[PDB]
Amino acid sequence: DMYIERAGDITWEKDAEVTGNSPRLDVALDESGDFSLVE
Amino acid sequence: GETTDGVYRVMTRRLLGSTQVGVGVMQEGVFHTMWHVTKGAALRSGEGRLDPYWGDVKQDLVSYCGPWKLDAAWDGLSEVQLLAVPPGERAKNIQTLPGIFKTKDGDIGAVALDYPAGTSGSPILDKCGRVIGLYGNGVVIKNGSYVSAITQGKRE
Numbered sequence: 015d016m017y018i019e020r021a022g023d024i025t026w027e028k029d030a031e032v033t034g035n036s037p038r039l040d041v042a043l044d045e046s047g048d049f050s051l052v053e
Numbered sequence: 054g055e056t057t058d059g060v061y062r063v064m065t066r067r068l069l070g071s072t073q074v075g076v077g078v079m080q081e082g083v084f085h086t087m088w089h090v091t092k093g094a095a096l097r098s099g100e101g102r103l104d105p106y107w108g109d110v111k112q113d114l115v116s117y118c119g120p121w122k123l124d125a126a127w128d129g130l131s132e133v134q135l136l137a138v139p140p141g142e143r144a145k146n147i148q149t150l151p152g153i154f155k156t157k158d159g160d161i162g163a164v165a166l167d168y169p170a171g172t173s174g175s176p177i178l179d180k181c182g183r184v185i186g187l188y189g190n191g192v193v194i195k196n197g198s199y200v201s202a203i204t205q206g207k208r209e
């Protein structure tokens with residue numbers, strides 16, 4: 015039996031750690047909801 | 054139990070110790086997570102029970118106590134914050150500019166940030182702190198790194 019515990023408010027935090035790139039990707043989505051790289 | 058808005062951890066005791074299987078958002082008395090986290094199972098909050106109300110394996114989305122409430126969208130321009138909630142670790146904002154999933158049915162925002170699968174369900178925010186979707190369903194790229202969709206539901 016799974017259960018939930020609160021972990022924080024939902025807020026924009028000015029001067030948070032700014033990382034990660036912005037890739038453009040060709041993908042397909044199956045009936046099962048799993049994504050896949052179309053190449 | 055606790056109905057306060059904000060982000061929650063999703064835990065099981067069915068394995069060794071207490072294990073965090075994913076994350077979710079309480080808003081307007083509705084709890085929003087990803088389907089692969091709960092598998093449409095009921096949840097506990099204090100002595101309270103949360104029963105599934107809506108879900109779709111293909112969207113990989115599921116709401117508890119009411120219909121999906123989160124109707125904010127990436128503008129396709131501005132940066133966003135992943136309010137990440139990792140297992141064992143404190144909530145932490147990570148700011149990024151999303152890439153794109155190109156599909157036959159349309160283009161979807163994507164966030165390239167790599168975190169344990171237990172982080173599935175963590176929300177993604179616009180500059181006004183509105184939830185524009187959920188992290189935890191996407192794809193592994195050439196490098197072996199993970200890239201997640203910005204997964205958003207439809208409100209009524």
Ligand SMILES: Nc1ccc2c(Cl)cccc2n1
Nearest residue numbers: 168169170172173189190199
């Ligand atoms: N390497 C991986 C594999 C699966 C993942 C899921 Cl399901 C969610 C978030 C990150 C992930 N990273």
